[PDB]
Short mmCIF file of C-alpha atoms in Angstrom, two decimals:
data_model
loop_
_atom_site.label_atom_id
_atom_site.label_comp_id
_atom_site.label_asym_id
_atom_site.label_seq_id
_atom_site.Cartn_x
_atom_site.Cartn_y
_atom_site.Cartn_z
CA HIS A 1 116.91 9.91 144.34
CA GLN A 2 117.16 14.19 143.74
CA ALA A 3 114.67 15.80 141.46
CA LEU A 4 115.31 19.50 140.10
CA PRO A 5 112.51 20.70 138.71
CA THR A 6 112.88 21.81 134.99
CA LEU A 7 108.87 22.45 133.96
CA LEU A 8 106.28 24.62 135.85
CA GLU A 9 103.11 24.18 133.78
CA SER A 10 101.44 26.39 135.42
CA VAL A 11 101.94 29.40 139.12
CA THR A 12 99.13 31.30 140.30
CA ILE A 13 100.13 34.54 142.65
CA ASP A 14 97.17 36.46 144.14
CA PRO A 15 98.57 38.55 146.76
CA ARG A 16 95.02 40.15 147.40
CA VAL A 17 93.65 36.90 148.37
CA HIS A 18 96.82 36.87 150.02
CA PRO A 19 97.16 37.92 153.96
CA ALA A 20 99.17 40.93 154.06
CA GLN A 21 102.84 41.25 155.30
CA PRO A 22 102.82 40.13 159.30
CA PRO A 23 103.42 43.53 161.37
CA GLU A 24 107.43 45.24 161.67
CA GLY A 25 109.54 43.29 163.80
CA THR A 26 107.05 39.95 164.37
CA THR A 27 108.64 36.87 165.77
CA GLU A 28 105.56 34.90 165.70
CA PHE A 29 103.55 33.82 161.98
CA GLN A 30 100.55 32.95 161.38
CA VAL A 31 100.65 29.09 159.30
CA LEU A 32 98.08 28.68 156.63
CA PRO A 33 96.78 25.54 155.34
CA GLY A 34 98.13 24.38 152.28
CA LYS A 35 96.70 21.45 150.28
CA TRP A 36 97.76 18.93 147.75
CA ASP A 37 95.09 17.99 144.72
CA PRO A 38 96.80 14.69 142.91
CA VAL A 39 93.69 14.62 141.10
CA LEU A 40 94.66 17.69 139.40
CA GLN A 41 98.48 17.92 140.66
CA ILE A 42 98.34 21.14 142.43
CA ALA A 43 99.87 22.39 144.98
CA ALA A 44 97.78 25.23 146.46
CA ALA A 45 98.16 27.20 149.60
CA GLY A 46 97.04 30.61 151.10
CA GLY A 47 97.34 32.83 147.60
CA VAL A 48 99.27 30.37 145.57
CA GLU A 49 99.30 27.45 143.17
CA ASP B 1 72.53 14.93 136.09
CA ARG B 2 76.16 12.97 136.56
CA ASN B 3 76.61 13.15 132.75
CA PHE B 4 76.38 17.29 132.86
CA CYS B 5 78.81 19.85 133.74
CA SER B 6 79.40 23.71 133.42
CA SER B 7 80.92 25.67 130.45
CA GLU B 8 81.92 28.78 132.77
CA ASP B 9 84.91 27.77 134.03
CA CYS B 10 87.61 25.07 133.56
CA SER B 11 85.54 22.33 136.98
CA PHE B 12 84.94 19.57 134.91
CA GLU B 13 88.70 18.43 134.43
CA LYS B 14 88.69 17.06 137.99
CA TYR B 15 85.14 15.60 137.71
CA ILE B 16 85.91 14.03 134.68
CA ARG B 17 89.26 12.67 136.46
CA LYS B 18 87.70 11.54 138.97
CA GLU B 19 84.42 10.65 137.18
CA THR B 20 86.86 8.18 134.70
CA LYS B 21 88.86 6.84 137.31
CA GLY B 22 91.77 9.13 135.87
CA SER B 23 91.40 6.88 132.68
CA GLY B 24 89.97 10.54 130.63
CA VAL B 25 88.06 10.53 127.51
CA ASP B 26 87.75 9.06 124.64
CA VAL B 27 86.94 11.05 122.48
CA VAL B 28 86.88 15.10 122.93
CA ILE B 29 84.27 17.39 120.99
CA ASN B 30 86.22 20.87 121.02
CA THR B 31 84.61 23.58 120.40
CA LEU B 32 85.86 25.85 124.11
CA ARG B 33 88.81 27.80 123.35
CA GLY B 34 91.42 29.25 125.71
CA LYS B 35 91.88 27.32 129.27
CA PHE B 36 89.29 25.17 128.38
CA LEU B 37 90.78 24.05 125.42
CA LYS B 38 93.83 23.31 127.60
CA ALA B 39 91.77 21.53 129.97
CA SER B 40 89.83 19.05 127.37
CA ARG B 41 93.32 17.95 126.05
CA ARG B 42 94.70 17.29 129.45
CA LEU B 43 91.48 15.07 129.71
CA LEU B 44 92.28 12.69 126.72
CA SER B 45 93.29 8.73 127.71
CA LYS B 46 95.97 7.34 126.26
CA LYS B 47 94.61 6.57 122.49
CA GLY B 48 91.97 9.49 123.67
CA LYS B 49 91.18 11.69 120.20
#
């Protein structure tokens, strides 16, 4: 089925711990590891949660 | 030592949830407030108080 989000209990954005914007005109971008936590139901990657 | 957690941060939620195998805690005697209170209710079992 198609699930439409209706409520995000928490969304934390912390750019200070996030990598800076890629140099201008970048063609290859970096990949940040991400993890899904079923116990707490947190999708975390970089400085976002 | 497995029965003790820390009051400094809400890291007990993951520990207790994992240790209870997702069942939660039947009774929560809550004194802390703020995010600790929110994390405490989130550990309640289906019939938890």
